């Protein structure tokens, strides 16, 4: 969507599973919100 709208911040995979636990287990643990 950010290709169509400059007003969308892109979030990459590692920006979403960013927690130290998530990295340690290699899964999502926390809900993440993106726009
Ligand atoms: N071959 C292939 N692998 C994919 C595809 N989409 C995601 N993956 C791979 O599958 C693995 C899991 O993706 P991920 O997005 O982290 O899964 P999840 O459903 O978010 N995780 P969890 O249930 O822990 O939240 C990753 O290694 C990713 O590269 C796809 O289209 N093709």
């Amino acid at each position: 969507t950010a290709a169509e709208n400059p007003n969308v911040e892109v979030k990459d995979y590692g920006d979403i599973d960013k927690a130290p636990e998530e990295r340690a287990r290699g899964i999502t643990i926390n809900t993440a919100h993106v726009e």
Side-chain angles (χ1 to χ4, degrees), residues 13 17 26-29:
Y13 182 69
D17 288 344
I27 49 166
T28 300
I29 287 169

Side-chain angles (χ1 to χ4, degrees), residues 4-23:
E4 281 300 275
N5 194 331
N7 277 338
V8 169
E9 249 209 311
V10 301
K11 291 272 182 296
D12 210 336
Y13 182 69
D15 294 331
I16 302 174
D17 288 344
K18 62 179 181 310
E21 319 91 69
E22 291 175 316
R23 299 299 172 101

Side-chain angles (χ1 to χ4, degrees), residues 1 7-9 33-35:
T1 48
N7 277 338
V8 169
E9 249 209 311
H33 296 248
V34 311
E35 172 178 44

